[PDB]
Amino acid sequence: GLEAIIRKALM
Amino acid sequence: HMQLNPESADLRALAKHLYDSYIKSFPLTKAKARAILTGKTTDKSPFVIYDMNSLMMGEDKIKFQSKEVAIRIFQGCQFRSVEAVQEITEYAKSIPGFVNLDLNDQVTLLKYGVHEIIYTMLASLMNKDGVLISEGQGFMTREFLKSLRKPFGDFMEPKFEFAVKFNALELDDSDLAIFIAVIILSGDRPGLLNVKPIEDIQDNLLQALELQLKLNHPESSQLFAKLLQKMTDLRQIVTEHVQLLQVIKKTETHPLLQE
């Protein structure tokens, strides 16, 4: 959940 | 003794770069927050939720579906935290050396830092009476949040407790930008692959933070040490927070997760 958002935001 | 040399100049340019990036990533700064909370602004005066009646009017006239007030409030809080994760990630990308780290390490730092930085940025939005919400359109009193039924009544209390003592240190946006960067580059997060490069960036951020606090706070010669003690406090505080987020999850039942 948290990882999902961080990863997409990091793009 | 302290000298204005090429090294101190580079730490000041790093401090300024983080401030600039901070101002960019976080729409509502502590300076603007303190202006709203102290009525030292021309900007629109926020709507005060101090009881159930003022909440009901507030929902209709804040302009941000469970039939429980307490659940609707907590959902707004969790939606704002997703948004805060995105703002903090965007900020993390501006820290020199951070986008150069193993992506998996970038994720781990953010995964374990965001909650600690959310407590920090919440203090900027709080005074003894309550917390600014809805990017400063609303203000919700500490005692009203505390009156919500179990287990929602105790959700915000530890953030207020942290904020009362953290705010007493009178940090500004220039101090906070570096403070938050020191938190993100914590070499001791579980599951990191390549620790040394994180400690190397952190060492530089710690030197920048120490200089910022000496130049900016002639009233406390050990403010640097006191801030490191807060990063230590924040660790166990987030432990308790994550603990309660569970008790809720398994006792009570955001569009970017659905996508």
Ligand SMILES: O=C(NCc1ccccc1)c1cc(Cl)cc(C(=O)Nc2ccccc2)c1
């Ligand atoms: O808008 C909120 N709740 C929705 C609502 C309000 C009033 C009536 C009905 C529904 C809300 C409530 C609380 Cl207690 C805190 C926050 C908030 O901004 N949290 C936050 C998290 C991370 C970083 C900064 C702030 C937002």
